[PDB]
């Protein structure tokens, strides 16, 4: 039970895992609000 | 940014000719009143002095910077253009 | 009206809400020491020279950036505020170079005058100072960044007044520098004004370099004629010869800046 | 009523997957009691959650020590047409601190549920997690957990069937300890340098993107849902008055078994070292000094720490402060002056440098301490250094200046004879 | 002490604005997601992630990469330069494919963190700030990495190796030299900062859902 370690998945993380997870979660999110302009320099 | 030199009124004479000294190249002035400057507490006192001494005078109203509203909050504005790009 | 009552050294005065402690002090008639605050530029809060004590408050507030509320009694000449000013000047002068005889801002330096009036008279800094390499931003502004106090006033002026984002702070900590990070010329029709706002001799006038001293010159208030704006100027002369031209304040025509 | 503290039952701890012996994904969290009756908590309203937190007596775990109920309460206002956000402080920049990493890489679902509960309580539209840049594996673990939550329809549109939409975002920093500070973190999220902004305006009025914002530590939001579920009175039962709850303690330095343990708040320092950490190496008599709250807090000698407790009030009485509860111990066989000089050097390397007091004075103190390590100075300088610290503390923008002044003050106050002896020796050898 | 890295940029044949750099289409998708994370009208908030992504594509950040990021995000290049020079994880110079960072802050320095640095220097034959002649390793000294309780420790390209000893660090270095990637984690048969023989906490089985829910909920 508690004798073994159960966090061995992170041994198999590449250099793009964070960004890939972000890009796949991009479809699960509500639309962002808007400030009314393209940018503060606009 | 100091403002301590803009408290009193100054009366000064007009600029006249200055030339280069033929020997040693110094600057020469033929008029005595060139270095003269007087300090007055208010405009009325200076005007009275000028009239009493019989000098034609030009008087200019004092210029004071207008009050300006400054807000720290404006730098991090949500929608207005006062947002700072960096600090 | 909506004016609120605030006390400066026990003297009451009416101020509109949103007025900072520094503006209330000016309204009473006193000038809080400052290095980074400019009325025409956004509030920064870097130099911490405007630190003033509010009565019955254990912490010293920054007068330039702190809005005042009803009932505050600003103790400008209190012991705590004086000690804070002395400490801030000591920290500012810890790494400043001994360049006063060769500096172009000798007799018109805010650092010198504010050290004379509000700072101490000796140094306990027994270490070696820092030194940063000079930048090149064109043939108008001579740049000596060893004298920079990192007030980020030129950066704000360029970003807001001139609309040019060439200037910025690169680095972190003591070795944070003000510059462009690349070999780029800061070129604009209002480029020279950064010479005037810079309190120290970090940014100076290249054509005027090593020419005169402020106490020598005579000031003549006149009108600029190179454009139809008619900005007011001060011709600074010396022994019957024009030394330089400086902007003159007029809130309705040119504010306090002039074109290149 | 209770006087003795320091005996926390195993079943009564908050983070049951602290050591990672169980599964950290959604199935493991559900098996351990996470995501249980969250819909009822959300439907109970923000006022009820805020009242539960206030009666819980929970205090800020980031190091400030402010009450979180009162802090959270500021955001509970009618909408002004601007979105409200919640920011979670996961920078972990303070030396000696490791708790947030272990609770973000081994129990992320508690963090996510706490983010949802806090957003509901404060009316926040979304929550931004600012994980430290170096923490890459745990950031991806948190991301995977977030994805799992989205699938189970636990967050996002109609989260938990309560008709409330909450989105959790994770952003990564890049090697900046100053980014731990709340305003500096807000600036970093906004895309600028991590330079703290002055207050006022407070983040509750003008925060991230100019919107109302509240910055809360990872541990605080992580324990919030458990307090809501089990009641605030139960959390208030532990510890003393104004110091209620359980705390995660990192113990490191010269100990036999440095470790992270969850324990009741007002546990004595000696009991905490001897029980969990296995005691000071070489016996208790070998202890020389201890910094109980990370680098920011001043150190205390053996005599003060013989009978001292771990809470905000008692450690403030000892002129130290609890801070982040990061105990670093040093035995008699170390150069304490060297350790404090290393800490001051760390503070010198990790200052944004926008305000002159912190920048110039901290570089000055680093130079002075490096000279002290060799004993190259004179005794009259020591008091000078003290004054320098007093010219830094209270005059800076953020608390990094105070956190750099305090270690020097504590070291001077408690080991002035050691410094004087070292400089006397240097004068003797160098004639 | 002294940094040793310049915060100004001088043009180089290797590092000039004409240096070729562009994002792969997958990186463009990732950039689109990153920008979509932030509210509209505040794309500048994506300066920090996108820049880091460029590093992951290239291994370091040339001036061309900074200019490309500024062009993509429609922000002045000076702000990108500020961000790059402020944060320490952005490599403005080329580095080895394995970047070793040793923590020497006081909690690590107490647990003999100098021995590991000396062992790395001896094994690699380089100083504390140089790089190997064959361009594989790059040693550097860093501040607290958040694993003080598991000291001493080393970070090598987003991987943490804890409870290190000279023998362990030499073994890690030579395994990296061979090619096989060593497993991240603490050494000496310990995982996630529990007492080595104490186990004073988290012993009995965890309690199930709804153990202590208060009444009325
Ligand atoms: C220089 C500096 C660095 C800080 N770093 C952290 C940090 O890494 N993690 C943290 O939780 N708090 C940190 N803090 C304390 C923050 O103020 C705190 O996160 C924030 O005020 C919210 O704290 P709370 O969640 O306990 O209410 C830091 C403070 C300063 C001045
Ligand atoms: S900037 Fe001022 S204080 Fe510094 S050298 Fe020049 S004149 Fe002297
Ligand atoms: S160059 Fe002058 S204006 Fe610019 S930051 Fe330095 S001191 Fe301030
Ligand atoms: S105290 Fe230091 S870190 Fe904080 S704002 Fe000032 S210079 Fe930056
Ligand atoms: S004048 Fe206010 S902080 Fe500089
Ligand atoms: S002291 Fe080594 S990781 Fe922080
Ligand atoms: Mg100047």
mmCIF file with all atom_site columns, N, CA, C and O and ligand atoms in Angstrom, chain C residues 105 195 198 200 203, ligand 7:
data_model
loop_
_atom_site.group_PDB
_atom_site.id
_atom_site.type_symbol
_atom_site.label_atom_id
_atom_site.label_alt_id
_atom_site.label_comp_id
_atom_site.label_asym_id
_atom_site.label_entity_id
_atom_site.label_seq_id
_atom_site.pdbx_PDB_ins_code
_atom_site.Cartn_x
_atom_site.Cartn_y
_atom_site.Cartn_z
_atom_site.occupancy
_atom_site.B_iso_or_equiv
_atom_site.pdbx_formal_charge
_atom_site.auth_seq_id
_atom_site.auth_comp_id
_atom_site.auth_asym_id
_atom_site.auth_atom_id
_atom_site.pdbx_PDB_model_num
ATOM   1  N  N   . UNK C 1 105 ? 26.345 69.168 -15.366 1.00 0.00 ? 105 UNK C N   1
ATOM   2  C  CA  . UNK C 1 105 ? 25.234 69.647 -14.555 1.00 0.00 ? 105 UNK C CA  1
ATOM   3  C  C   . UNK C 1 105 ? 25.738 70.037 -13.173 1.00 0.00 ? 105 UNK C C   1
ATOM   4  O  O   . UNK C 1 105 ? 25.097 69.739 -12.162 1.00 0.00 ? 105 UNK C O   1
ATOM   5  N  N   . UNK C 1 195 ? 16.994 65.614 -21.793 1.00 0.00 ? 195 UNK C N   1
ATOM   6  C  CA  . UNK C 1 195 ? 18.109 66.252 -21.101 1.00 0.00 ? 195 UNK C CA  1
ATOM   7  C  C   . UNK C 1 195 ? 17.606 67.052 -19.907 1.00 0.00 ? 195 UNK C C   1
ATOM   8  O  O   . UNK C 1 195 ? 18.217 67.042 -18.832 1.00 0.00 ? 195 UNK C O   1
ATOM   9  N  N   . UNK C 1 198 ? 15.977 64.753 -16.886 1.00 0.00 ? 198 UNK C N   1
ATOM   10 C  CA  . UNK C 1 198 ? 16.961 63.946 -16.176 1.00 0.00 ? 198 UNK C CA  1
ATOM   11 C  C   . UNK C 1 198 ? 17.610 64.775 -15.074 1.00 0.00 ? 198 UNK C C   1
ATOM   12 O  O   . UNK C 1 198 ? 18.337 65.733 -15.362 1.00 0.00 ? 198 UNK C O   1
ATOM   13 N  N   . UNK C 1 200 ? 20.091 64.316 -13.141 1.00 0.00 ? 200 UNK C N   1
ATOM   14 C  CA  . UNK C 1 200 ? 21.538 64.224 -12.986 1.00 0.00 ? 200 UNK C CA  1
ATOM   15 C  C   . UNK C 1 200 ? 22.210 64.417 -14.337 1.00 0.00 ? 200 UNK C C   1
ATOM   16 O  O   . UNK C 1 200 ? 21.538 64.605 -15.357 1.00 0.00 ? 200 UNK C O   1
ATOM   17 N  N   . UNK C 1 203 ? 22.250 62.272 -18.793 1.00 0.00 ? 203 UNK C N   1
ATOM   18 C  CA  . UNK C 1 203 ? 21.909 62.737 -20.131 1.00 0.00 ? 203 UNK C CA  1
ATOM   19 C  C   . UNK C 1 203 ? 22.168 64.235 -20.195 1.00 0.00 ? 203 UNK C C   1
ATOM   20 O  O   . UNK C 1 203 ? 21.569 65.001 -19.433 1.00 0.00 ? 203 UNK C O   1
HETATM 21 MG MG1 . LIG F 2 .   ? 20.541 66.413 -17.165 1.00 0.00 ? 7   LIG F MG1 1
#
